[PDB]
Amino acid sequence: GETEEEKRKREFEEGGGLPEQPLNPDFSKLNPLSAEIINRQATINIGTIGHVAHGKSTVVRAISGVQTVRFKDELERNITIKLGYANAKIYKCQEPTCPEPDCYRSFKSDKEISPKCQRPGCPGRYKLVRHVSFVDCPGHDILMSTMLSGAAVMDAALLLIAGNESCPQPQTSEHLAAIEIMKLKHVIILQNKVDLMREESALEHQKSILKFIRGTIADGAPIVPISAQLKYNIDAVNEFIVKTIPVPPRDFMISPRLIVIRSFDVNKPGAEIEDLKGGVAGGSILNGVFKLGDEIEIRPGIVTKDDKGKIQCKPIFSNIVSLFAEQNDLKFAVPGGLIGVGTKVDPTLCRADRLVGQVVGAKGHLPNIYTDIEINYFLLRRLLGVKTDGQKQAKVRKLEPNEVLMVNIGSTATGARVVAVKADMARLQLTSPACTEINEKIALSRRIEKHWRLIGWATIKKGTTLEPIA
Amino acid sequence: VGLPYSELLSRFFNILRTNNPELKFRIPPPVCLRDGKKTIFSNIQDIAEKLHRSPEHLIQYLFAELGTSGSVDGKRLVIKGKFQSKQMENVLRRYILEYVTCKTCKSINTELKRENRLFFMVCKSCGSTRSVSS
Amino acid sequence: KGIVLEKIGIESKQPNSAIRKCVRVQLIKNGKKVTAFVPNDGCLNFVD
Amino acid sequence: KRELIYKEEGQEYAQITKMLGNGRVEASCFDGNKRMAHIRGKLRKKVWMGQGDIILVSLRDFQDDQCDVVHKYNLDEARTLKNQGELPENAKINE
RNA sequence: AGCGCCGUGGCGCAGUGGAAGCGCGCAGGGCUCAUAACCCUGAUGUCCUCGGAUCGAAACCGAGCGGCGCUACCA
Ligand SMILES: Nc1nc2c(ncn2[C@@H]2O[C@H](COP(=O)(O)OP(=O)(O)CP(=O)(O)O)[C@@H](O)[C@H]2O)c(=O)[nH]1
Ligand SMILES: [Mg+2]
Ligand SMILES: [Mg+2]
User: Fold this and answer.
1) How far apart are CA D45 and CA A34, in angstroms?
2) For residue A175, what are the contacts with CB-CB under 8 A and spacing of at least 6?
3) Sign of the alpha-carbon torsion through A289, A293, A295, A297
4) In the sheet where B33-35 sits, what is the strand order?
5) Residue A332 belongs to some domain of the structure
6) Is residue A259 part of a domain?
7) Within this chain, do residues A340 and A200 fall inside the same structural domain, yes or no?
8) Chain B residue at shortest CA distance from A239
9) At A446, which CATH number?
10) How far is C-alpha A60 from the chain's CA centre?
11) Cα(B47)–Cα(B30) distance, rounded to whole angstroms?
C-alpha cells in the first residue's frame, strides 16, 4: 500500500540518486562521459528542424519529457520565438538477454544513475550512455534569426517530415541547408506521420525522401519512422543518437568563451525583494569550462548612441553567482551544453529580448567588437523556402551596394549594409555591434518576398575594431 | 542505405494493427422540431453523447453562433424562435469540424478538459495538445 | 429540322394555369438551341 | 374533419426545405433529392404553404428535376402518416 | 504567477450598506378590419462561496472558487 511517490523515491535512492559534483576534480582527466560530468549535465546538443505546424516539441516531449512551455498568450498556439529545451538521459540495459532495439531508454534529467528496466521480465538495471540537450527550433518562414542561431549552437540534427502532406517541403530543405552551412554533418531523418499512411504510401514517401537527399552534402543520413503522439520507437532513436553521432572534439585546452542565446530574469512576483535572485544569461558554451565565482563580461554589452550618433559599447562585466545546468546546482559546467549563467547582472538587462545573440568572455581574454566586417561569402543558385507554382525556383541575385541583409554571425543578430561587392569578398557595416573571436560561422539572408530568406554562407577574414570603453 | 528504416516501419504497422484492429459516420440525423414561433431540439442529448461532448458546452456554442437564449428540460432544448434545420445542421457540422473532430488526426476520442484558466481540449486516441475555445 | 435534347415543360402565364408541354431542340442547320411547343392533348408521349 | 389522402404511383410526400419566390418552392422529397416544385392551381392562393410542413407533390415522368405540389398536410395528417410510416422516419418533423 | 475587475431573473446594467431590482426578452389580454409598432399585467433568483464587524447585509472587509484584461512565462 505504498504511495507512488514513495516507490519513486525508493527507486531513486536504489538507482544511484543524483550525485553532487566534486568541488575540485582533476580537470585534464575529465572526459565528456565521466560520471561527474554525465550524470548531471548535457554534453551533446541535439536539435529538431522541420516545417511549421507538424510537431517538434511533441517529439522532444515524447523523447525526454521536459516541456518547451510555448508561452505568451498568442504564442501558446501559433508559433514561438524562443527555442525550446529539454534534458534527456539516454539509458541502455546492461543485460545482453533483452534485445538491443528496446534496450535504450531516454528519461528525464531527474532520473537516477541506474533506474530499473521497465521491460517486463528484465531485472537488469540501466546504464547512462550519455546525457544530451534538446534545442527545439521554431520552423516558420517569418522566424529566421533564432533558427540560424540555434543551428550554430547545435551539434547534431533531427529533421522532421510529415507523411500525408507534400513531399518536398521547402522549409525542411532550408533548415537542412542551413545545417550544412554551419558544419553539421550528423542528421537523422524522422517520418512523423506513419500511422495515418498506407504501406505503399509510406514507401513512396521514403522514395521521395531519398530522391530529395541526393545532391545535399549530407548523404547517408539514417531515416527513422517515428510517432510523436503515439509514443513509440524512441529506444531505436536513442540507439541512432548513440551510434551515428560521436562526441565532437572538445577539451579544456581552449580559452574560455560563452554565447548568450536567451536571457532570463529571476524575479518571482508576489515575493518580497529582500529575498531575490540574480539575472540569468541562457548561454551555449562551445568552449571554456566555467566555475562558481568567475568574473565574466558581455562584450557587445551596453549599446549606446552619442549625441553625434556614434556607436559606443560598454562591456557588461559580471560575477558568476551560479551555473544552473540540467536539474541541480553544479560546480563546473561542461562546454557544449546549454546552461543558465545566473550572474549578478541587473534583472531588467535580462527581461525578454535583451541578451539574445551576444558573445561573452571570461576574464583573461579580450574579444574585439567590429564596426566594419569584410566577409568571404558564397551563394546558392536557387532560393529555399519559396513555393513557385510550376516554374523555375527563385534564383539568388548578386549583392548590391548599400543594402540591408540579415547577417547572423554565429548567434549575433545584425542587419548589415554593403559597402562594396567583389568576386568572392564583400564589406559590411553593422548597426548593432558584433564581436569576433576566431572565425565564427555566419549565415546570410536578404529581403525579397516580404520576410528574410537565406542566401548562402560567409566568414569574416578582417574588419575594423572598436576598443571598448572601460 | 535505407535498409535500417523500413524495418521499423513494418514494426510500427504491426503494432498499429494489433493495438487498433478497428482502424465519424455516427452523427445523429438532426431532428429539428419547429412549434411555430418555438423551436425544440429533443435529440440534443443523443448528439451530445454520440460526439463525447457535454451538453452544457454544446448549448453554449449554440448560443454563441446563434444570438438567442433558451431553456433545458427533461435532455431537450427549447428556444422560442423560428429557425431551419439547415442552419442547425450547418452549425453542428462546423462544431464537429472544429470541436468534435481533431484537426491533426481523424479521430473522435478527444474530449473537453482544462489545463492556467483557458479551456484546453485534449486528445485521448493519440494524446495531442490542442485548444478550441473561441 | 432539329434534334431533341430534353423535354422541358414550361409554366403558363398569369390568367391561365397549366404546364404547357414543350421540348428543347438543337437545330441541325446551325446548332442553336430553341424551345419548341408541341400542340395536342396526348402528343408529348409521341415525341420519342 | 376531412379525410386524408394517400399517395398514388408517382405522387409522393415531401417537405418544404424553403419556399421559393414568384410562386415556386423547394421540396426535399422523401426519396433523397432536393427537388424544385411549382405551387399548382387549386392550391395557389387559397391554401397557404408554410416553410417546414409535410406536403404531397406530383412527380412528372418527363421531368424528374421539377415537380408540382398537389395537396398539403396540416401537420395532423402528417403526424398520423409518420405514425403509420408513409415516409422515411429519420426526418421527423413536428411542432 | 501577481495585479484591475466581475460574479444576475433568460441576457444586459445597477446601487452596494434599510434587504428583490429596470430594459431587452416570453405568456396574457388591450388598440387595430387585421399584423407589426405601442399599451398595460404576470411566473421565475443561493446578486459566487466560508466567515468577521454591524439593530441590519447581497452591500464594509478578510480566505477561499470560478471567468476574465494586462504585466509576462518572469533560471
Ligand atoms: N497526427 C499527428 N499529430 C502530431 C504529430 N506530432 C505532432 N502532432 C500535432 O501537430 C501539432 C503541432 O505541434 P507543435 O509541436 O506545436 O508544432 P511546432 O513545431 O511547435 C510549430 P513550428 O514548426 O513553427 O515551431 C500538434 O497539435 C501536435 O500534437 C504526429 O506525429 N502525428
Ligand atoms: Mg517550441
Ligand atoms: Mg403553374
Assistant:
1) 96
2) A49, A50, A137, A139, A147, A151, A159
3) positive
4) B33-35, B38-41, B76-79, B71-73
5) yes
6) yes
7) no
8) B4
9) 2.40.30.10
10) 13
11) 8
What's the one-letter identity of residue A387?
K
Contacts of C44 in chain D (CB under 8 A): 62
Instruction: At A216, give phi and psi (nearest 5°).
Output: -85, 160
CATH second-level architecture of D1-95? Beta Barrel (2.40)
The integer distance in angstroms from the CA atom of B37 to the C1' atom of E37 is: 19
Contact A77, A83 (CB under 8 A): no
Q: Touching A: which chains, 3+ CB pairs < 8 A? A: B
Which residues, 6 or more positions from A400, have their beta carbon under 8 angstroms from its beta carbon?
A418, A421
Mutate to test the pocket of ligand 1, among A49, A54, A146, A231 (most ligand atoms within 8 A of CB): A54
- HEC string of chain A equals CCCHHHHHHHHHHHCCCCCCCCCCCCCCCCCCCCHHHHCCCCCEEEEEEECCCCCCHHHHHHHCCCCCCCCCHHHHCCCCCCCEEEEEEEEEECCCCCCHHHCCEEECCCCCCCCECCCCCCCCEEEEEEEEEEEECCCCCCCCHHHHHHHHHCCEEEEEECCCCCCCCHHHHHHHHHHHHCCCCCEEEEECCCCCCCHHHHHHHHHHHHHHCCCCCCCCCCEEECECCCCECCHHHHHHHHHHCCCCCCCCCCCCCEEEEEEEECCCCCCCCCCCCCEEEEEEECCCCECCCCEEEEEEEEEEECCCCCEEEEEEEEEEEEEEECCEECCCECCCEEEEEEEEECHHHHCCCCCCCEEEEECCCCCEEEEEEEEEEEECCECCCCCCCCCCCCECCCCCCCCEEEEEECCEEEEEEEEEECCCEEEEEEEEEEEECCCCEEEEEEECCCCEEEEEEEEEEEEEEECCCC
The grid coordinates of residue A388 equal 513557385
